[PDB]
Symmetry: D2
Subunit: 237 residues, 4 copies
């Protein structure tokens, strides 16, 4: 069914479905078993920042994750997205919790997409930046347990009144408008996404993670995609 390209921030090592033995960042092309991963020194309760970049000349999806005053983790992968995704896609954020849990809070998110033609001075661009989410965010499609407005934040997975994270939860937020990633006469196509997140868990082994994904425009949360499946895939194939 859905086509998914995601950058995952996987907090719980399910070494049974391929995770390394630690929290890691990975690049997933159509499967939960990452094509590439990097060790991520995850910090409970600290605000992190994820940066994701790509361009159709280099055909390399790269991601960098950092915490203030910390060394950063980075992961890269050669892949031609023209061969994996449709011409028009929707971009979004997803997260889940399972028997273990954590809060998956998004404090900001910006995205920029550009298509430059061979025509003199011809660039098509899309840019959005959210530094504050409101209770009725009409430019986002919220799926699952995702909600906006709490503390002006985006809560991807369920959190009780006190802000405690609930288990077995899954939620996604997609930017309302379709994004154009390929064009017949495009000489260069590129995108970059940035998001700041706060993962906090009362547990020692928090789970599952957060992912930035790009999918077919009509993507929806697959059945049984809670836990280790990050609200993105239907199975662990």
């Amino acid at each position: 069914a859905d086509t998914i390209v995601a950058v995952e921030l996987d907090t719980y090592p399910n070494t049974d479905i391929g995770d390394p033995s630690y929290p890691h960042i990975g690049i997933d092309i159509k499967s939960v078993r990452s094509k590439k991963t990097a060790k991520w020194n995850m910090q409970n309760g600290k605000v992190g920042t994820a940066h994701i970049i790509y361009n159709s000349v280099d055909k390399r999806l790269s991601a960098v994750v950092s915490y203030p005053n910390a060394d950063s983790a980075t992961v890269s992968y050669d892949v031609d997205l023209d061969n994996v995704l449709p011409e028009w896609v929707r971009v979004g954020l997803s997260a889940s919790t399972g028997l273990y849990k954590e809060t998956n809070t998004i404090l900001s998110w910006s995205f920029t997409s550009k298509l430059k033609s061979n025509s003199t001075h011809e660039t098509n661009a899309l840019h959005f930046m959210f530094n504050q989410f409101s209770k009725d965010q009409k430019d986002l499609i919220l799926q699952g347990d995702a909600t906006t407005g709490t503390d002006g934040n985006l809560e991807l997975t369920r959190v009780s009144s006190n802000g405690s994270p609930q288990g077995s939860s899954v939620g996604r937020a997609l930017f309302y408008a379709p994004v154009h990633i390929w064009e017949s006469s495009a000489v260069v196509a590129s995108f970059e996404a940035t998001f700041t997140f706060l993962i906090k868990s009362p547990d020692s082994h928090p789970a599952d993670g957060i992912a930035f994904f790009i999918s077919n425009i009509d993507s929806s949360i697959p059945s049984g995609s809670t836990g280790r499946l990050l609200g993105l895939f239907p199975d662990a194939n």
Copy 2:
């Protein structure tokens, strides 16, 4: 029904419904009878550029229209858009033809909207830029006779195969995503729109015009809004 704020480029003087005796630019707040107009020295077959700006501190909607190597026309109006439009709106371009006609071709369109909070470093922004339209532009809602892709342009009103403009036509194009123009804690809100257009008519008295508008998100072309009513209003009140 609909709430409309538009900047019109009115090519045909219907002095019976308030137009001056010449082609003019005007600012319309909920009625086709402009609150303010400026004389516009319209050029048949030349590519023009319209710039529209506004900010919630000054509460002034201003518009500038120019042609290369020509003096420019400008029109301004004090108005607090918080008191006229809803919190969430859709922005778009509209055009019409009646017994007289012309081509209403859009070659490019960019829009930028920003909401800056009192929170340190908190700006929400939306920006889009089209320098090339494709036949299946999924981020635009096309209404009426508007079509995209011809010569990579946006044709707001009907044009025969040879590119001749048809009479009694009306079409609009709206950016797919809702735009947020007011926010509770916003200290400054602003927007700016730019579009380049080509108005060409085989006639001496071309009609009717083109307008940049902002409306409720569910706006649709009112009945009998061809001609002088610019695809925007239902009557000449």
Copy 3:
């Protein structure tokens, strides 16, 4: 000598040279006696944000100052900067202390200037954004006691090792490159500046203030411009 246009954040009421009886924001055109002022509820030790905007269609310099969780102060003034400043200018930040004092710390500064011609698709733009200053900031001209790099901040006026503010100090920081604010064929010219500042004083009556200014490119700190003269004017005329 110098030509100065400044937006002042005046913390000390010198009602003898025209200040109101309280901390205020004012717009200064070539004299320290503001053309217009607004009451500013200044907060000791809180991080504030100043936004300044202008455009050559409206010919209105407006400024908004806010603190998180606070109502904001705003001040506006009709003025055609084409008639006051040269074609090429330098933009900067200035501050001073006198018998009373305070720290004048700048945590971030961004500026955007645009000149749009009547030529199709012809915009000249300059944009800079500093969210971190380094000890050897080669794109800034530092005058007086201004220094960079401390805590990655810009310190406009002298501060002892413990960060205590010194009296009788004056410093300015100017962006290295000249900025083009008018152009023969320009149909619209605009600029916007944003800066976040931290004013902290161990005193009850802190003094003097901070100002965003625009001046001739060879501007330098006038003699005896400490205190109430904000490092900008030579006298209180």
Copy 4:
């Protein structure tokens, strides 16, 4: 002496100093003998567009050159610019002519540089865009025969009154302000440059080319750097 990183658009094949047997695009790291080249189907008298991108995560300098309605040429090279250039550099355009010649006209140039820290929300950015050059362009350092203002264009090498290109000419234009390309705590550093050029020659074998370069901030045209040496290197080593 100078440190040079350049993207060359080499119109004349000096196969004696390493050029392929045709017009090509190449990436030069400290020597005129390109580390990498691509065949470039050069078009006399047509307006081309060069796009150059780089980011410190991928450590790949890539360049794309196109003409309207033409297939584009692209060239890439893995190189860590932190190991080749200083922390602070100046960016510019250079060109030359020798016994053979051509006009080296620049119609537009934009550059964007960003440094993103590990600090939450901390980006330093520089952006400039010239779509029109004026006779007294105070934000550019012009060296050699480069001049501005003709037809609102930048003429890198000498052209007689009729616009005929002169031989043995060399000129460069550098953006006035120093650009910061590395920073201690930077997690990601990137830049992108775009320029449109018009190479026209009354000859069958036009020479020599144009190059986008990055150098030490005090770079100046080396002695005898006309012709094949592109105003960038002192010798063909």
